[PDB]
Design a protein around this ligand. Structure first.
Ligand SMILES: [Mg+2]
Ligand SMILES: [Mg+2]
Ligand SMILES: [Mg+2]
Ligand SMILES: [Mg+2]
Ligand SMILES: [Mg+2]
Ligand SMILES: [Mg+2]
Ligand SMILES: [Mg+2]
Ligand SMILES: [Mg+2]
Ligand SMILES: [Mg+2]
Ligand SMILES: [Mg+2]
Ligand SMILES: [Mg+2]
Ligand SMILES: [Mg+2]
Ligand SMILES: [Mg+2]
Ligand SMILES: [Mg+2]
Ligand SMILES: [Mg+2]
Ligand SMILES: [Mg+2]
Ligand SMILES: [Mg+2]
Ligand SMILES: [Mg+2]
Ligand SMILES: [Mg+2]
Ligand SMILES: [Mg+2]
Ligand SMILES: [Mg+2]
Ligand SMILES: [Mg+2]
Ligand SMILES: [Mg+2]
Ligand SMILES: [Mg+2]
Ligand SMILES: [Mg+2]
Ligand SMILES: [Mg+2]
Ligand SMILES: [Mg+2]
Ligand SMILES: [Mg+2]
Ligand SMILES: [Mg+2]
Ligand SMILES: [Mg+2]
Ligand SMILES: [Mg+2]
Ligand SMILES: [Mg+2]
Ligand SMILES: [Mg+2]
Ligand SMILES: [Mg+2]
Ligand SMILES: [Mg+2]
Ligand SMILES: [Mg+2]
Ligand SMILES: [Mg+2]
Ligand SMILES: [Mg+2]
Ligand SMILES: [Mg+2]
Ligand SMILES: [Mg+2]
Ligand SMILES: [Mg+2]
Ligand SMILES: [Mg+2]
Ligand SMILES: [Mg+2]
Ligand SMILES: [Mg+2]
Ligand SMILES: [Mg+2]
Ligand SMILES: [Mg+2]
Ligand SMILES: [Mg+2]
Ligand SMILES: [Mg+2]
Ligand SMILES: [Mg+2]
Ligand SMILES: [Mg+2]
Ligand SMILES: [Mg+2]
Ligand SMILES: [Mg+2]
Ligand SMILES: [Mg+2]
Ligand SMILES: [Mg+2]
Ligand SMILES: [Mg+2]
Ligand SMILES: [Mg+2]
Ligand SMILES: [Mg+2]
Ligand SMILES: [Mg+2]
Ligand SMILES: [Mg+2]
Ligand SMILES: [Mg+2]
Ligand SMILES: [Mg+2]
Ligand SMILES: [Mg+2]
Ligand SMILES: [Mg+2]
Ligand SMILES: [Mg+2]
Ligand SMILES: [Mg+2]
Ligand SMILES: [Mg+2]
Ligand SMILES: [Mg+2]
Ligand SMILES: [Mg+2]
Ligand SMILES: [Mg+2]
Ligand SMILES: [Mg+2]
Ligand SMILES: [Mg+2]
Lengths: 209, 56, 114, 118, 123
RNA sequence: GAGGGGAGUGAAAAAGAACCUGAAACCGUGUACGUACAAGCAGUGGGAGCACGCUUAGGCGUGUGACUGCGUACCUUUUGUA
RNA sequence: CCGACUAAUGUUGAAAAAUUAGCGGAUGACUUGUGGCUGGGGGUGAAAGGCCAAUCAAACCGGGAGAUAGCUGGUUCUCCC
RNA sequence: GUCGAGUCGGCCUGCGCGGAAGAUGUAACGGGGCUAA
RNA sequence: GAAUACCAAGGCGCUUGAGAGAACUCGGGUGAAGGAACUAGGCAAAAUGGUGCCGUAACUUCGGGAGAAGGCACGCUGAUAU
RNA sequence: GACCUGCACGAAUGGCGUAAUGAUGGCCAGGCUGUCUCCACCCGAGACUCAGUGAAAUUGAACUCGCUGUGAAGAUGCAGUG
RNA sequence: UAACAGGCUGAUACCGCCCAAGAGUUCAUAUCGACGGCGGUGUUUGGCACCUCGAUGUCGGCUCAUCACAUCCUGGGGCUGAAGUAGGUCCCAAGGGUAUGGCUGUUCGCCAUUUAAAGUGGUACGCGAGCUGGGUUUAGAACGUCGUGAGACAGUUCGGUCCCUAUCUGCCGUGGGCGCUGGAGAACUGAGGGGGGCUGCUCCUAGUACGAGAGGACCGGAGUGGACGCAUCACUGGUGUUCGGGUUGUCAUGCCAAUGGCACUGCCCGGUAGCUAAAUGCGGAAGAGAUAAGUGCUGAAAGCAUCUAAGCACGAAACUUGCCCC
RNA sequence: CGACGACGUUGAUAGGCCGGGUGUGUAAGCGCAGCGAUGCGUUGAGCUAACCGGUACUAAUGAACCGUGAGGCUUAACCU
């Protein structure tokens, strides 16, 4: 099943009648405009490419503008692709809105996780700290050993060490759909989703179900 | 920790392959005084975007 | 953001009485014991108030059956059926955490005559 | 990480920064134009402009608030008697920063910061 | 939020006054016991003529914690101290006949209905 | 200012006082060729291509060296050393 | 003021023994300035082989002196048998 | 008593089968591959 | 009090600066719940901390132990007393 | 704290006690805590970037990969291979 | 030319197998296996002296691991002296998982209390240019003991300096160059690589099947946890020297009043955003393919029998996918 | 650090400014009561960072720079 591109508005709660507070991420899903349909004959696979939102005209380059104009669709802020299932058909220029999730119980949400910059092994990999005291010399958050001896005489590939953390694609799976609000272009899902307020999100019906 | 072998002049040059300075691509011309200046900076004679901002 | 403020405004209680730290309040909360739902009162001094729109909260301290207990209520939660001020207290701080180290006479709060 | 945080440390402690910007706001009010490093000029906006906004409303309490900041009654007097009136109809942006190259001693990026109607 | 070495007050008349958690039961590397959780204890102080003696090793169920419990609406209930009710090591039923101070609805279970019945107040 | 370019002296200033000759290590600028899918004592045997130049107009000379066979420095000490 | 019990730092140091937080003595067998005396198998030592000019199970400088070294290293152009 | 071409279990011998678990990586033909290579 | 804090007289900002606001190191501040479970060892850190008064055990060489332990009061204003 | 089976105590190279004293050795408790469960955030000095100055140990020469094997018997440099 | 580690060896050690006296009511072979026999590993105790004495830091802890499988748990299976429950024994299986404390320098061990389980080994008895430095193994001192004595003792006791700014390989991240054949902006495909893969308890099926009873299931389903991981900040909280306040000493702004500086942010009480765990969402799977041990169908060679030779079907956390990231 | 994303007057990119929120907890001044410390009123006052909604006041300058001008050979399938 295809998904939709939205935007992380933020989190709030829904109080139910029986006194449960449901933490929800509010996702603004404006209409997704189909900009290109890809088929097996021309592209080797079946997919739709969509756009959403809007971009200032002088920020749209002539190549991107020609691509939008061929679809007869106003320019959105980006282009995202969704693979098509067997019973799935779409037309160029078609608008797809958040009522797509009207009957969907659970969704997978993909965003770009917040960026922690250069992270140490303690933060990045949950390495334990060495002694704060008891004689420890300059080695309180340092990684410890990184290998063996002469055998093997090298560090193994994939060794956990300090480095860039976050600012990467992350998917959180099978979040409850709390509410679909077609009039306000809003999807509320229970729980946290990746990324900072205002960032793009990709929402698809849950793959695990 | 220190080298076991003397690095070559070749390796020294390869390392310095990123050390070259970059010249300012273009200077700007004040519309009133006609003098050259760094873009978004005032001129030597106290002009910015045609206005005599600083005297003396 | 306007979107989230709309979503929260639609959920907010419109009948919340005014109260201040140091007031004695009685909170009636729903308790479900089987298919039976009934109201249970929790009465004590307000030692903290968090003013945060739909997410507003307040903390009530009481000595109950020989034990000090604090309950942090979510103001706009349907679990809270009603709030009523039993006594206006006169204090000067926003947060009355110092009362945690007071008992009896040293824990008294002057009434706010107004 | 410094997400959403505001303010430059400027390789100083807070008390030093506070004193420095008190002095520098005094100098800008006195001379109406000063040369400093670009980052310091950008930080100085956030100190001087609220002082002018405060000076727009002349009262004993506002003069005392201006004195608690500034600690200079000549500066306070200039604020309330001249700058507030001069800027009475200007909604913010009482200062202008003009980049002016690099310092000889340390290649520090430099700028003039001036009052907009100087 | 009780762990090994935590001292607890006693909310029953079993005769113990102070006990110490020596194991959080019910899981490998399990760190903490909360309200409603069963711990292994040693009695560190006890009144002269009670049903239990200093140095006995037995079980207890935590019934009050400073960390407290959360409720479905997000509210919390916190207590000024940590307290437990001593349980027979095999049957895991209370040793005492009276329960002191308030307890919480988290103890409403088949195993701890007796504590709910005896408690003066359930929060 | 330092330093330099001229002018002049001188047989000579590339004898200018940081001064006869002015080697090598080491560091540059210029030109030719090679070099960004390629694994190791860096050479050696084979070898295309490019550039420059040669009195017979023919191949040759000089420089470079794609690709390819083989190939673990030297001394010392040792039964024996990459 | 005289010391130097613990830790961290520093360890191509700010320093060839320190800095910082703590620590001991602080009218005494105390501590300090100036000058004096004891000299190398000798001095001096509330004694650790401690100290005797960043040197101590025999100071430093010069001399015997090129001690001796059955040990280690090194030993320089070519070709022929 | 019943079917119509062999049946049985000892020996000697050629080639093979099991017995046969190890640590960075195939890793006990130098490799590819080979039923002959 | 020659301690300490802030100042006077007086003398100084320590002869590289400017930015940034990663890991990690150094020197510090604070920390939910727990409270020595850390570790060779409470190393380090945290803690105690003043004055007056009340009160203070075994033991003892009759001096001590002892500031044992433990506890109470403490600012400001007015009067007693311009 | 006892027992005595003192491998191998013992009476001025003193025996056994001993109040007081000790930056002395061992053990236990109250308090206290980031010592720890289990780390989080923060303030500063470095680390990072720009401008100025400008070291060091080491160094046969280097066109300085992994693996399995070989081999002066633990290989970037040998073989095969990735 | 010894002590450490490597190397060679494998007597010794550990593991496996062969024969089967006998135990096992009966019955060698459910389980065990005498007297003897044959191997595997490199794994203990050793042997040797090949590498290093112009130096290859040697116990234990900490941090961080990585591999083997002779498997501790979880998974699949045969036999049982397997009624059930729970066991024994062997086979397959390395995906993931696989205690915290008291004592002691300990490793180990014993002990307490957990757990589904608390695996066994290799990796310079992995890891000190990563930490420690309690132990061993300098100089001080003392005891016992030996010695006439200087001194000595894998006997004991109290004390006792752990350096290195990373050139190369490697590894975690992150750019610059050129290439990809006119140049450019985008969206992709997916060769290939990495991550992930754990599990308890409760309830139902069912007090059923089994069983004289005591007890008490398979198969299948439901919920809720421990540990781990990813994200996030709505909630609960920490921090919050950039916000507000209280307060001690002092100095100043002429003074009063009001303020500012300094004293660890002077000391404190609160606390915004952000960052964050103790906070709260989510995950491990299902399914599919090909299999292991194992079970079979049909079936001759060998008129029978036979899961196998021809053919055909099942079969596990291993393998290939499915899920996530590059 | 490079990098990556947004924005550059046809503009909400940042600062300021306006409104709000949040936090602290009733400013200053004046008045009243009290011999006074102080209390009370004006007053939930004053102040309020990194937050939310807005706003061209300030700063994001016209330019300039780089990058080119129809893109190899052969063969095949076609279009002429
Ligand atoms: Mg970031
Ligand atoms: Mg730890
Ligand atoms: Mg050190
Ligand atoms: Mg440290
Ligand atoms: Mg070497
Ligand atoms: Mg460089
Ligand atoms: Mg910001
Ligand atoms: Mg600096
Ligand atoms: Mg200060
Ligand atoms: Mg001249
Ligand atoms: Mg001559
Ligand atoms: Mg010359
Ligand atoms: Mg090439
Ligand atoms: Mg290739
Ligand atoms: Mg070769
Ligand atoms: Mg030899
Ligand atoms: Mg050789
Ligand atoms: Mg001394
Ligand atoms: Mg000191
Ligand atoms: Mg004394
Ligand atoms: Mg003294
Ligand atoms: Mg001696
Ligand atoms: Mg000396
Ligand atoms: Mg002599
Ligand atoms: Mg002689
Ligand atoms: Mg000689
Ligand atoms: Mg293998
Ligand atoms: Mg002083
Ligand atoms: Mg910092
Ligand atoms: Mg630190
Ligand atoms: Mg602290
Ligand atoms: Mg804490
Ligand atoms: Mg606490
Ligand atoms: Mg405690
Ligand atoms: Mg311990
Ligand atoms: Mg431990
Ligand atoms: Mg200490
Ligand atoms: Mg302290
Ligand atoms: Mg004796
Ligand atoms: Mg005698
Ligand atoms: Mg004696
Ligand atoms: Mg520099
Ligand atoms: Mg190479
Ligand atoms: Mg290798
Ligand atoms: Mg090898
Ligand atoms: Mg050996
Ligand atoms: Mg051996
Ligand atoms: Mg020999
Ligand atoms: Mg060796
Ligand atoms: Mg050597
Ligand atoms: Mg096996
Ligand atoms: Mg595998
Ligand atoms: Mg799998
Ligand atoms: Mg243990
Ligand atoms: Mg203990
Ligand atoms: Mg080792
Ligand atoms: Mg090991
Ligand atoms: Mg070290
Ligand atoms: Mg090492
Ligand atoms: Mg000695
Ligand atoms: Mg993987
Ligand atoms: Mg928030
Ligand atoms: Mg808080
Ligand atoms: Mg604070
Ligand atoms: Mg403040
Ligand atoms: Mg005053
Ligand atoms: Mg001052
Ligand atoms: Mg001062
Ligand atoms: Mg048959
Ligand atoms: Mg405001
Ligand atoms: Mg105030």
């Amino acid at each position: 099943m295809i998904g939709l591109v939205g935007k992380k508005v933020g989190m709030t709660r829904i109080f139910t009648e029986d006194g449960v507070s449901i933490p929800v991420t509010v996702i603004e899903v404006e209409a997704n405009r189909v900009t290109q349909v890809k088929d097996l004959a021309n592209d080797g696979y079946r997919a739709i490419q969509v756009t959403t939102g809007a971009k200032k005209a002088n920020r749209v380059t002539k190549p991107e503008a020609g691509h939008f104009a061929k679809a007869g669709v106003e320019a959105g802020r980006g282009l995202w692709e969704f693979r098509l299932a067997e019973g799935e058909e779409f037309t160029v220029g078609q608008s797809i809105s958040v009522e797509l999730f009207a009957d969907v119980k659970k969704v997978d949400v993909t965003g770009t996780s917040k960026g922690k910059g250069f992270a140490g092994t303690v933060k990045r990999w949950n390495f334990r700290t060495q002694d704060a005291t008891h004689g420890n010399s300059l080695s309180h958050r340092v990684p410890g050993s990184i290998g063996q001896n002469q055998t093997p005489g090298k560090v193994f590939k994939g060794k956990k060490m300090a480095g860039q953390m976050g600012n990467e694609r992350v998917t959180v799976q099978s979040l409850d759909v709390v509410r679909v609000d077609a009039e306000r272009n809003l999807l509320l899902v229970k729980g946290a989703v990746p990324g900072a307020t205002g960032s793009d999100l990709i929402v698809k019906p849950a793959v695990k179900a | 920790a220190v080298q076991q072998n003397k690095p070559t002049r070749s390796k020294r040059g390869m390392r310095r392959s990123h050390d070259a300075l970059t010249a300012v691509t273009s200077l700007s011309v004040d519309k009133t005084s006609g003098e050259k200046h760094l873009r978004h900076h005032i001129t030597a004679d106290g002009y910015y975007r045609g206005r005599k901002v600083i005297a003396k | 953001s306007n979107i989230i403020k709309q979503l929260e405004q639609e959920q907010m209680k419109q009948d919340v009485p005014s109260f201040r730290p140091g007031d004695t309040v009685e909170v009636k909360v729903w308790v479900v014991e089987g298919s039976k739902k009934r109201l249970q009162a929790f009465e004590g001094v307000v030692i903290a108030i968090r003013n945060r729109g739909l997410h507003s909260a307040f903390t009530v301290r009481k000595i109950s059956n020989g034990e000090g207990v604090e309950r942090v209520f979510q103001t706009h939660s349907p679990v809270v059926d009603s709030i009523s001020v039993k006594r206006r207290g006169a204090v000067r701080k926003a947060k009355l955490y110092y009362l945690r180290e007071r008992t009896g006479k040293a824990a008294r709060i002057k009434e706010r005559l107004n | 990480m410094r997400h959403r945080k505001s303010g430059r440390q400027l390789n100083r402690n807070s008390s030093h920064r506070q004193a420095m910007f008190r002095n520098m706001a005094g100098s800008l009010v006195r001379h109406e134009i000063i040369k400093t490093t670009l980052p310091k000029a950008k930080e100085l906006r956030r100190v001087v402009e609220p002082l002018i906004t405060l000076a727009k409303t002349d009262s004993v309490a506002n003069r005392r608030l201006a004195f608690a900041r500034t600690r200079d009654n000549e500066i306070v007097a200039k604020l309330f008697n001249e700058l507030g009136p001069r800027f009475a109809s200007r909604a913010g942006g009482y200062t202008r920063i003009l980049k002016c190259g690099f310092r000889a001693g340390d290649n520090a990026p430099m700028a003039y910061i001036e009052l907009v109607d100087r | 939020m009780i762990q090994e070495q935590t001292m607890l007050n006693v909310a029953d008349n079993s005769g113990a006054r102070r006990v110490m958690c020596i194991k959080v039961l019910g899981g490998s590397h399990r760190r903490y016991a909360g309200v409603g959780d069963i711990i292994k204890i040693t009695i560190k102080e006890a009144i002269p003529r009670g049903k239990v003696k200093k140095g006995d090793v037995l079980k207890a169920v935590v019934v009050r914690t400073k960390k407290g419990v959360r409720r479905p609406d997000g509210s919390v209930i916190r207590f000024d101290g940590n307290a437990c009710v001593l349980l027979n090591n095999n049957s895991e039923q209370p040793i005492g006949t009276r329960i002191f101070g308030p307890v919480t609805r988290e103890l409403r279970s088949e195993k701890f209905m007796k504590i709910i019945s005896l408690a003066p107040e359930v929060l």
